[PDB]
Write a protein that binds this ligand. Structure first.
Ligand SMILES: NC(=O)c1ccc[n+]([C@@H]2O[C@H](COP(=O)([O-])OP(=O)(O)OC[C@H]3O[C@@H](n4cnc5c(N)ncnc54)[C@H](O)[C@@H]3O)[C@@H](O)[C@H]2O)c1
Ligand SMILES: NC(=O)c1ccc[n+]([C@@H]2O[C@H](COP(=O)([O-])OP(=O)(O)OC[C@H]3O[C@@H](n4cnc5c(N)ncnc54)[C@H](O)[C@@H]3O)[C@@H](O)[C@H]2O)c1
Ligand SMILES: NC(=O)c1ccc[n+]([C@@H]2O[C@H](COP(=O)([O-])OP(=O)(O)OC[C@H]3O[C@@H](n4cnc5c(N)ncnc54)[C@H](O)[C@@H]3O)[C@@H](O)[C@H]2O)c1
Ligand SMILES: NC(=O)c1ccc[n+]([C@@H]2O[C@H](COP(=O)([O-])OP(=O)(O)OC[C@H]3O[C@@H](n4cnc5c(N)ncnc54)[C@H](O)[C@@H]3O)[C@@H](O)[C@H]2O)c1
Lengths: 428, 428, 428, 428
């Protein structure tokens, strides 16, 4: 089997997307711009596990353009875009992913990306940990062949840190999830753009003059609050951390407990990443037709079960849009059944945010692979200079003119003209 | 013929919409709250010409709930929503409108709303002027029967002022288009919400870090500029009026000529309402894949013909999304073929903005009809106290607590406790 | 007597100020740029009554540079800046104004500006109405000699409208107070800049994280709210007008009654222009050390008498800064004794706002005087094209590049290439 | 000698200040609220070297209220406020500081805080390093007596890291300068408030409609850019770091080089902290009367010498306000002679920012002293839980209602209900 796609007749339609997305993903394109000749990953056989979408497709072809051997599989049974997957398979790349697979076909798709024409994979590019996990639990033999790993998710990195603590980790990893260019875009800037896209696409509701309660003031809460605020809404924040809470207050946001906020909000967004954010006692207080959605942790922040078990009626207005009737006589509009609203009611993050996240993947791959004896078994952070690098790949499209430190100023600041410009503890 | 709808089997699905929109249209609901008993329009036979949509539907039932006899027809061959029209016809109301009619069936639908069981229409509720025009040019006999007119559009009002200047106007009108609650919502607040809805639905493009050039700084340009600015874009304004231009400068926006701005922008929005805004000489300078859309005057602001006649390729990416290839090698993404992007790539204005516009209609109808000898033939402005009134109908849903002037303060300010609080020349 | 200044030895120090202010007052400078040669006011003998300050000084010399004969007096016993008045007197111009005059010397100063070497004044440039009043009540003989009046204040214009209603008005006036370039700057933009200057200069208090209650959402409330909001404060608005209240809600501001807001705010600003805004019942609820100031109507919005009559202690922290101790144990910091905080705790409005207000004066003077039989006795509004004109005098320093309508677009828009670009009813 | 103050007759006036500042410094007040009874610092003899001001005064009395023995001296010859210093000395506390001391009396003032009635100091609270340095270079004998150090400045901490690298450091330190509550307030929030206070107090210039060029987008540049933006200016950023540069672009700011920006700006702010930011080649291009000031590193960012050596004229407009005339005919307004504008043209940071910085000091002192064998010789970071703690001391005055994690959620999140809520690598 060369690959397994739903319909390869879709390839021609996928390429169209790829060539449009490319213009919005400068990181990946500049990667090809400076390395496609040097082929830094020449020799590597990257087994990738990442949702197969137009953006991910652009990444793969970049990995390939840098001289790498690549085998791909999605990291979610549905997340994969078929015309994008088809174009890859059709590109002569082995991809095993179709939208809506079985937990059984999924594990198989992955198993396929482990062995190449010249042998087994020597590098991992994971989003979620499944790839890295499957190898460790079932293919420990191959382990000694993989030069390094690449993780871009909290979950993925958490388990990575866990395995390591258990001496389980045998191949060194690079945590690209905590890069500022990755995090800021994945969390802050991304949700800032798509949050309202979801709410509007599901309700077409006016945001101005409304009270929006955003639970949590982390990067996502920050982007969501900012987003809503720009539309004319009165954002109220809830938090458990004193520092994030203070950050919000300092910005003009009222900070209360959900127990109080629930009686005031017209729109509710959870950014927590923790359980029991919006409960039944809150729903009973919410104004009529309050919109409740979640953009943090998949479906565990809102108590949907309660809505299902206590509402007098429930009518699906449209896909990912339900409107419950409470015994108190008030209606509650729920979005995406409590799952991520930006992905469930919108198209998720814009390509540009993807460009930063993925370029980090390329950055990691190029480094691990290129520096064989540099990283001991363990989950490391992406060297700052590399993080700074993915940032610079986007300046330009943004049409930003970066100034260069003179030898004099560099010496004054006691730092390299190109070398990292900030300490590791620096929080931008 | 009782009515003419595409499919009355749609009624049940329309009602659902109506009952959802109602919650977002307080003006109309409060109208019923205080007048449905007094039936202020009791005796009137309103012939209405307004796109038949869920929002317009809610309005009609409010006119009816106030004791009026109503006959309806859309004011655009396509604008009419059928499940919303069906529910009206099914409600026992005579509506003549289906999406996609012929210029012939359109004139007929209108002709139908002129005669009631008890005689001909005695009142007009028009959006566009067609109704008022058709009567004047073809049914002058009825003219002496209509107590008054209601116009809510510039076009509609312009022609009204014109007819009057020609002594053609025989029935007094009330220009509700220039009410601040009507205008601010229809122009400022509405486009502020939907502009980005359009661009995102068509391109799913990241707005932050992009240069947006908004041509014109009127109410629409103001809303569009504010909207984009909140997303992280660098808005550059163009203008012909020194006062609007100054207004923009005072707010931090750079103001230049399109001739220069064209070489800098990534997104282009026209708010002008005038011709020749974006020409071929501009396209030839725009960056690769610049997005160009219009939200002002229907399709006359951008030079689409040129794109059609000078591009090397043209490919429809999706409905209302075309991507031209210029001889210079750059691509230009055009939205809604130069027509309104919020209506052509999104769902138009939210119900709340509709609630303000329509409540003005109800306000006008109630006044003209209720004051037989108050208004001489001529296009008048909606009394300020009525404009203030539609505003108050929305405070509350907005959860705004308006304070009341004491008799002392009222005497001090030399104004009524409820009477108008500002002079006519006041610009909020 | 040639003039009456406190100390003419101050002249050299005044000129320094004048030459610095000039750079920030383009309107007056462009006036001289295009009219100092044509001398449009050649022949006029302007009797002016306007606080004698550096800005006003720049204006006078502009009136003079345009070929006019000018005699000046301040319109407030203290508002006059002496080094600015001295430089004028020293410039060979007759000015009768010193800071801190007696209600007796004030009336005399004014009486002096009525007669010139070539006869009595034939034009009035008033700010307050005193000049125009004094002539009407005591010098009716001169009345027939004055070609026109210029008023730039509400008070002034109110009385102007009153006199007219009583057939008292004998010389036509031009209400420049309602120009958008005058109003927006005097009210909106000015207070936006100076409000915080006052609070900071009096308290040096951090604004971020604080709740600021702004009473009134008119032009001043708008600027004050915007100002505070930008500093990170949570602004709560109070209003009696539904339209202004809605405008605030649509912008994300909570709107309540002072009765409730008083228990929440940390800073209080009155923008009302009406009495009994902050009363004793409010003070008793205010948080400890709440800052209360007024920027609307001079000292009638806050109930200071109550503070004086009910506080347990009162200690003057510094000029224009008092801190009362209430029986409840809470302290209340009052600013400028309830009088205007921006003038009383800061330097008032920046020169640029003055430039717009004054250029209006020049604009009015040039028009009335130049068009002898154009204006019938009555208070008229400044022609829009003139209002637009003062706006354009500032574009440039702002470095704004206004685009010019082509003959084609002008015809399309049905408006002049330079002629007014908007209808009188237009509210920018 | 018990202490050395300029004038102890000033004490009574100092106390007034102290009791006003206290209300704006909750951190210090809550410190006393919970520890004044337990006297956590009971036994310590703190030798402090910190500018003696009203704020610092409040801190000292807090250290004393916690059961500590304290001896104080300023860390700048002028920074010390005398009425604040007098009230401390008068309070029975030994303070050696007066505004305007000699580099000789300064070293002596410090020497005084080294020995107590019960022996030498056993703890250091330093701002700058002088204290810690003086002991190391001249009093190594005492070294073994000090349980720990507290540094809150970059300079101070830099040297600390340096000494340590040279094995010189003998007593462990705690870098409180890098706490987020310290840094965010000292750098971001503080300068955001005072920047404009400076410019306005020196020039009283309108900010709106002006182009402000902020060099550097670090914490200060962020606050300064945000500040100016809120006033209506068009902020242009310059940067050497790609990440900060991208951060700015993503927020709507144009990013260029000073070499280009210089030809556009009206106001110039340096936030760099590096040399040669604004040079003569820039001045020669700046618009007429451009305002140039520095708020970053004391006087090394702007090339003042050049202005001095190349201007045709130089006239001091007022203290800390000079206006040079260049050979090109343009004038350049310089603020605070290139030194910090917020301190030199304004009153510096508001008390609240001081409250966060100082509470960090108290936090450090309480920890080091209370945990004798917890910290090995070396510069450590303030435990996150302590940083979170100083944050919570201010929630409340801000009237923020922090929610508490349930045992369930805490277990889910795998974190303590009160324990730190974020990893060390977390950048808020
Ligand atoms: N839908 C998306 O596109 C998308 C993209 C990135 C991240 N996320 C998810 O969003 C969540 C937030 O991530 P950040 O945004 O990266 O996380 P974060 O750790 O920076 O912030 C989460 C915040 O929630 C606060 N919080 C925790 N429990 C709370 C509670 N009970 N009530 C109120 N506040 C509480 C925390 O103090 C913290 O500040 C995570 O689950 C993350 O995986 C979603
Ligand atoms: N798509 C929608 O939903 C929607 C809703 C309401 C109004 N509109 C339309 O949008 C347009 C703008 O309306 P406003 O927003 O009410 O109009 P407006 O009159 O207040 O402002 C239009 C502005 O365009 C400026 N302008 C005119 N010609 C120009 C040119 N060549 N270059 C630059 N600026 C120029 C004018 O000076 C004016 O300030 C109108 O055509 C209006 O009918 C669209
Ligand atoms: N200090 C200054 O520099 C300065 C400059 C210009 C104007 N002003 C003064 O400020 C005031 C405001 O002027 P605008 O700003 O031009 O006036 P405005 O008429 O536009 O608005 C005043 C607002 O106050 C609201 N209001 C009235 N009574 C109220 C009450 N009891 N509670 C709440 N809101 C109430 C009104 O509805 C209105 O919207 C006027 O007195 C004006 O003369 C001061
Ligand atoms: N005046 C005050 O009240 C006050 C308060 C705190 C800090 N500061 C000072 O302000 C400076 C900035 O501190 P942050 O604000 O903490 O520093 P930072 O390190 O976070 O940021 C400084 C920024 O300047 C940029 N930069 C460096 N050289 C540059 C150059 N030649 N051109 C353009 N950008 C350049 C850097 O990339 C960096 O992002 C420091 O000197 C700090 O000590 C002043």
């Amino acid at each position: 089997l060369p690959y397994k796609v739903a319909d390869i007749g879709l390839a021609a339609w996928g390429r169209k997307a790829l060539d449009i997305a490319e213009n919005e993903m400068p990181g990946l394109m500049r990667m090809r711009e400076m390395y496609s000749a040097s082929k830094p990953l020449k020799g590597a056989r990257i087994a990738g596990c990442l949702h197969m979408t137009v953006e991910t497709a652009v990444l793969i072809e970049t990995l390939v353009a840098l001289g790498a051997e690549v085998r791909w599989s999605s990291c979610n049974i549905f997340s994969t875009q078929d015309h994008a997957a088809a174009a890859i398979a059709k590109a002569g790349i082995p991809v095993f992913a179709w939208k809506g697979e079985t937990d059984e076909e999924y594990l198989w798709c992955i198993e396929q990306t482990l062995h190449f024409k010249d042998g087994p994979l020597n590098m991992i590019l994971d989003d979620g940990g499944d790839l890295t996990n499957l190898i460790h639990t079932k293919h420990p033999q191959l382990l000694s062949g993989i030069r390094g790993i690449s993780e871009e998710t909290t979950t993925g990195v958490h388990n990575l840190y866990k395995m390591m603590a258990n001496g389980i980790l045998k191949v060194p990893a690079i945590n690209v999830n905590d890069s500022v260019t990755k995090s800021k875009f994945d969390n802050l800037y991304g949700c800032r753009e798509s949050l309202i896209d979801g709410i509007k696409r599901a309700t077409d509701v006016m945001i101005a003059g409304k009270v929006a309660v955003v639970a949590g003031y982390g990067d996502v809460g920050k982007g969501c609050a900012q987003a809503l605020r720009g539309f004319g809404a009165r954002v109220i924040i809830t938090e458990i951390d004193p520092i994030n809470a203070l950050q919000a207050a300092m910005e003009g946001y009222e900070v209360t407990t959900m127990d109080e906020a629930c009686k005031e909000g017209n729109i509710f967004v959870t950014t927590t990443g923790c359980v029991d954010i919006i409960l039944g006692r809150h729903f009973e207080q919410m104004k009529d037709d309050a919109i409740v959605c979640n953009i943090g942790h998949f479906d565990v922040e809102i108590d949907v079960k309660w809505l299902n078990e206590n509402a007098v009626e429930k009518v699906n207005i449209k896909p990912q849009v339900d409107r419950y009737l409470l015994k108190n006589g008030h209606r509650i509009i729920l979005l995406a059944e409590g799952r991520l609203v930006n992905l469930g009611c919108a198209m998720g993050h814009p390509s540009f945010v993807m460009s930063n996240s993925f370029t980090n993947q390329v950055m990691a791959q190029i480094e691990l692979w290129t520096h064989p004896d540099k990283y001991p078994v363990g989950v490391h952070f992406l060297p700052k200079k590399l993080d700074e690098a993915v940032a610079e790949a986007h300046l330009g499209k943004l049409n930003v003119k970066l100034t260069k430190l003179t030898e004099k100023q560099a010496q004054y600041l006691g730092m390299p003209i190109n070398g990292p410009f900030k300490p590791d503890h620096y929080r931008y």
